From a paper:
Here, a method for presenting crystals of soluble and membrane proteins growing in the lipid cubic or sponge phase for in situ diffraction data collection at cryogenic temperatures is introduced. The method is a variant on the recently introduced in meso in situ serial crystallography (IMISX) method that enables crystallo­graphic measurements at cryogenic temperatures where crystal lifetimes are enormously enhanced whilst reducing protein consumption dramatically. The new approach has been used to generate high-resolution crystal structures of a G-protein-coupled receptor, α-helical and β-barrel transporters and an enzyme as model integral membrane proteins.
The β2AR used in this study is the carazolol-bound form of a fusion between the human β2-adrenoreceptor and T4 lysozyme. Crystals of β2AR grew in IMISX plates at 293 K in 1–2 d. The space group was C2, with unit-cell parameters a = 108.04, b = 170.58, c = 40.44 Å, α = 90, β = 106.30, γ = 90°. Earlier attempts at RT structure determination by the IMISX method were not successful, with the highest resolution reflections reaching 4 Å at best. 104 partial data sets were processed satisfactorily and merged, providing a final data set with a total angular coverage of 312°.
Residue numbers in the entry: 29 to 230, 1002 to 1161, 263 to 342
The structure:
Amino acid sequence: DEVWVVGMGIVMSLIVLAIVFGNVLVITAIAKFERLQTVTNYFITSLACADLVMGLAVVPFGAAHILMKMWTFGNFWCEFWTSIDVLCVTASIETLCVIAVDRYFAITSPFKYQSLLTKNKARVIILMVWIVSGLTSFLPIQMHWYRATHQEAINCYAEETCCDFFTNQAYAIASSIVSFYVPLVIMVFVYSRVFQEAKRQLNIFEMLRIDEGLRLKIYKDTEGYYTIGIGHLLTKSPSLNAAKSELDKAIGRNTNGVITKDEAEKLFNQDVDAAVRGILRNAKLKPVYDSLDAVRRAALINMVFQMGETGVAGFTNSLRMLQQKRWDEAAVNLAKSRWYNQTPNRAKRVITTFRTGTWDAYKFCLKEHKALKTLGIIMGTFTLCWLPFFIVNIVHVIQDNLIRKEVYILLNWIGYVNSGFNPLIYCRSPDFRIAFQELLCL
Ligand SMILES: CC(C)CCC[C@@H](C)[C@H]1CC[C@H]2[C@@H]3CC=C4C[C@@H](O)CC[C@]4(C)[C@H]3CC[C@]12C
Ligand SMILES: CC(C)CCC[C@@H](C)[C@H]1CC[C@H]2[C@@H]3CC=C4C[C@@H](O)CC[C@]4(C)[C@H]3CC[C@]12C
Ligand SMILES: CC(C)CCC[C@@H](C)[C@H]1CC[C@H]2[C@@H]3CC=C4C[C@@H](O)CC[C@]4(C)[C@H]3CC[C@]12C
Ligand SMILES: OC[C@H]1O[C@H](O[C@H]2[C@H](O)[C@@H](O)[C@H](O)O[C@@H]2CO)[C@H](O)[C@@H](O)[C@@H]1O
Ligand SMILES: CC(C)NC[C@H](O)COc1cccc2[nH]c3ccccc3c12
Ligand SMILES: *C(=O)CCCCCCCCCCCCCCC
């Protein structure tokens, strides 16, 4: 009865604590560590600020409203508190929308995975977002455009103890469409093509980058020989400067044992080309390669990279089954390899590629593609937490009072609670994660 309201107070208090704590941690980590100061994370700050204000200024008074079963803060704060609520929700979806557009142009740019924005106009953009949100949110509420004209609403408006968001149908449609729906549809569309573009970036270079690894410094392979990039043997000589002489020769400058990622790609493309020409010479490998599609050809090249031509020609049964496009049967045999024993994970991806003829086994392996997924979860989680509430907004314009009020309020709180989710989702990122553990005296 009244023990339940103490318990509900505890829960709601923890919710308030969770939102403010996590979002302050995000804001702190980005502001403190220069590594985290990217154009993307500036928008995350804008996003964390909206959630923080939601935390401090919006949720406690909403919680007090429900527990006290009445509004005890007067009608100025009621209109002000309502304004901040709408603003924070509007600013969030707008910021999320800006991120999607920003990520789109960053991934379609010849200078990949970096914004077309300097840190300063990015700040400007954020300022404009908050200003547009303010104009969209604060203006209609304080200009009383939102208000309904029927008597029950007028009672609530005048009553200093009643804080209910009675709205006229013109506002309810327009406001919810402008604030929520317009940047939602844009965000969902734009970021869906962000994913398609990211998936399109997958090729044999990314494949071997994931399976083999890319080193910028000269290193020794398992047999002790000097190597660099993606398994590119420099020399069998035990002399380090012999390797460096060989490296400088191939790259075309004085490297001192260090090359760039793009330079490693140049070496890799040359190794791929050599691998293909050797395959076409090998009597046992040529018919298989000729029959295979582009993606599966990359899988076969992947194996030649790891085993050499002689090693791959050893699989006599698998090769003929690949040649006949009996993928599953080829998979059964390749899984019984010494190759699968020693490096099961890599073999698993290559074999799976042989089965589907797609790059699906290499999705979200790259650190950059994982980052895109985290942002995708942020957007999705926001959508799912707020969409039911905003659907009911429009449902009641069509036919009012079809949904019980305690359901409407509950949906609104699923929206509120979303403000505490984003900080936890950021723990997916390795950089945020260690940024957090430093900050927590760990
Ligand atoms: C308005 C009332 C209800 C809420 C209090 C607003 C506070 C939480 C907001 C308003 C202005 C915000 C800040 C504005 C300036 C930046 C610089 C950035 O590098 C880190 C975050 C930081 C420092 C913000 C964090 C918190 C902040 C101070
Ligand atoms: C409307 C009242 C109640 C709250 C004020 C909204 C605050 C939280 C908004 C208003 C202008 C915003 C900021 C505008 C400029 C930037 C610079 C960027 O580097 C970090 C975020 C930051 C700092 C924004 C987030 C926080 C911010 C300060
Ligand atoms: C009214 C309620 C919401 C106010 C509660 C304020 C709490 C959430 C604030 C007040 C002091 C804050 C902390 C102060 C000490 C640090 C260490 C720093 O490296 C990271 C942030 C961290 C961990 C803060 C996290 C949250 C914190 C505990
Ligand atoms: O056999 C052809 C390629 O072999 C090297 O790259 C191998 C390396 O031999 C091996 O130790 C390791 O396990 O795999 C890498 C690549 O997967 C060559 O130096 C390449 O240039 C050859 O194409
Ligand atoms: C307790 C109430 C005040 N909380 C409202 C939601 O948190 C935020 O709802 C909105 C956010 C952004 C734009 C909006 N337009 C609306 C029209 C009717 C109802 C809510 C909204 C709305
Ligand atoms: C290791 O970083 C983290 C330890 C930091 C301890 C700081 C102690 C903060 C105490 C919080 C009290 C503020 C409560 C405010 C209530 C209104």
